[PDB]
Design a protein around this ligand. Sequence first.
Ligand SMILES: NC(=O)C1CCC(F)(F)CC1
Lengths: 179, 235
Amino acid sequence: AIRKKLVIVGDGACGKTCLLIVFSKDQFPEVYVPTVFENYVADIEVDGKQVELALWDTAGQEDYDRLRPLSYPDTDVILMCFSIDSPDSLENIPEKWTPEVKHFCPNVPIILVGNKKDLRNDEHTRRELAKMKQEPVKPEEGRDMANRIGAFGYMECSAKTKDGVREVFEMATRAALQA
Amino acid sequence: SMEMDEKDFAADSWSLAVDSSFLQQHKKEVMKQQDVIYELIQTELHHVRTLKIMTRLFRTGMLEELHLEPGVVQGLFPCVDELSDIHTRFLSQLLERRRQALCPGSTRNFVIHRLGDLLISQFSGPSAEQMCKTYSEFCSRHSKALKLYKELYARDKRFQQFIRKVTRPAVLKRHGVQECILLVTQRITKYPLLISRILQHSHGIEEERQDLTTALGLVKELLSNVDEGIYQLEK
Ligand SMILES: NC(=O)C1CCC(F)(F)CC1
């Protein structure tokens, strides 16, 4: 049971806290969704290999450029998150998070994850974005960003419906094993 | 941690911690606020418990079982006694505010109407200065503690044996040496998240919305000061 470390990075409303909570609980928080995530060690068996995957969040550190890098030591896989209902959080991926993740974590695989994919069919989300001369992030836009930033892969999920969530963490484990 | 407190904070929320017929007597907006207040205290309990694992189990254990020089242990657990004192006093004030709020004949049913005053005292004056200086110190020695751990574990069999031994219980799965050090560094950046979500549901009593707005600003000023005072030391 090899031990590996996962760190999730991204803007404030990219849904990274919800994703970790939903993965670490599995049984959906119907009564109360917590504000913060402390840490978690998941037992994952992917492709017949057993791994202890430590999960960390960078929420609350987005404005503190000297505190934030203390999350990176010994990271084996990076989940680079953006929200599908926020095209601006996607344009901050190559400009802000990638130069920083590659500086502190060279050779560490990066998986680009488009969170909140359920909001593509949300008429209120489409209406709000249309007011700002915008549309929800298209799948090919996510794939094009992941190609341009040199990501190990592009994945989509929905913390609300749990759709795509297990597959993101199983693939992150596989990426962390590669050496 | 103590059994009395663990039970009081075992539930996933305030709405689940209190008796069902007590919850039923409150307005939804109160339940929403109380859930976030309960989370702030619950995470402060885990924060203090992490610091006690670092001091009693890891730090004292090494001194009483290994022939490590005290300078090495100081490098592994920087500012832990001082951090333990700050957060144990803060937790004591939070736990007392909850107990004062309990209904007679109950050890579970409570509503905390005032929190901002307690949050202003903690994050202002001498108490805030002590946290700013202790966290700027801790976070500057953070990397050097991880490298000292990795070096000692990969070179000393007696240290490896000690670490495998003390971390064997299931309750310490996410609480190894490096994990404790990162849990502590990340704690201060959780407060603005919790205080803003509590503030979001405290607009009913204007004296409280202002107290919480003041506390929110005090924490951001503290974080900005800790962040400015950081500069990575090396072994
Ligand atoms: N974590 C929560 O919000 C709830 C939902 C599921 C449960 F009832 F099992 C436990 C509390």
